[PDB]
Paper text:
The human AIP gene encodes a 37 kDa protein of 330 amino acids that, based on similarities to other proteins, is predicted to have an N-terminal immunophilin-like domain and a C-terminal tetratricopeptide repeat (TPR) domain. The TPR domain of AIP is similar to other TPR-domain proteins consisting of three pairs of anti-parallel helices and a Cα-7h. We present the structure showing the molecular interactions of the TPR domain of AIP in complex with the peptide-binding motifs of HSP90 and TOMM20. We found that the EDASRMEEVD (HSP90) and AQSLAEDDVE (TOMM20) peptides bind within the TPR-domain cleft and adopt a similar backbone conformation.
Interactions between the TOMM20 peptide and the TPR domain of AIP are similar but not identical. The main differences result due to the need to pack the first glutamate side-chain of the TOMM20 peptide (AQSLAEDDVE) into the hydrophobic pocket that accepts the methionine residue in the case of HSP90 peptide (MEEVD). While the side chain of this glutamate enters the hydrophobic pocket the carboxylate oxygens point back towards and interacts with the side-chain amine of Lys 266. Consequently, Lys 266 adopts an alternative conformation to that seen with the HSP90 bound peptide. The conformational change in Lys 266 acts like a switch that not only allows the binding of the TOMM20 glutamate in the methionine pocket, but also allows the longer C-terminal glutamate side-chain of TOMM20 (Asp in HSP90), to pack between the side chain of Pro 232 and Lys 266; and consequently form a hydrogen bond via a water molecule with the side-chain amine of Asn 264. Significantly, Arg 304, whose missense mutation is linked to disease, was found to form interactions with the aspartates of the TOMM20 peptide (AQSLAEDDVE) bound in the neighbouring TPR domain. The structure with TOMM20 peptide showed that electron density for residues Asp 172 to Arg 325 of the TPR domain was visible. Structural analysis showed that the Gln 307 and Arg 325 amino acid residues (all clearly visible in the TOMM20-AIP structure), are further away from the TPR domain-binding site than Arg 304, and are not involved in packing interactions or in binding of the bound conserved peptide motifs. Thus, the rearrangement that allows the glutamate residue of TOMM20 (EDDVE) to bind the hydrophobic pocket also allows the longer C-terminal glutamate side-chain of TOMM20 to be accommodated. * 10-mer peptides were used in the crystallization, but only 6–7 resides were visible.
Numbering used by the authors:
A (entry chain E): 1 to 6
B (entry chain A): 172 to 313
The structure:
Amino acid sequence: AEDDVE
Amino acid sequence: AEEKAKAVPLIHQEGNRLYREGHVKEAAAKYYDAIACLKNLQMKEQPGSPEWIQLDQQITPLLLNYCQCKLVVEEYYEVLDHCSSILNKYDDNVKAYFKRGKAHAAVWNAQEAQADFAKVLELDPALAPVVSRELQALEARI
């Protein structure tokens, strides 16, 4: 998700 | 400094854990420390060299993680700068365009947001649903 972290 | 290249992945992992647990402020501190390690290593390398570039690339996702934490705590000025720095070197970085767009949108830079969100769309079409949503929300405040 774009609001998760890599 | 060099002995702490081993610390970075563990710090990265702890930051992620904290982030997903909801401890966003603490996660940011972790990311900041991981990036600081890599920057210290990078200072020993010649800018533009393979080793400098490799470290620069290891920094990118950690710096975007850090920016993600800043988005959550509603601090936009550093997101804009760090994302801009990343994008000025790596202009195909989807996540950087998206976060910068979020930050532009949050500070009422509607035109810069639309531009960034267009770049997200251009580079990763699978994100069309999200982008549409961000665009619809911008238009709503118009």
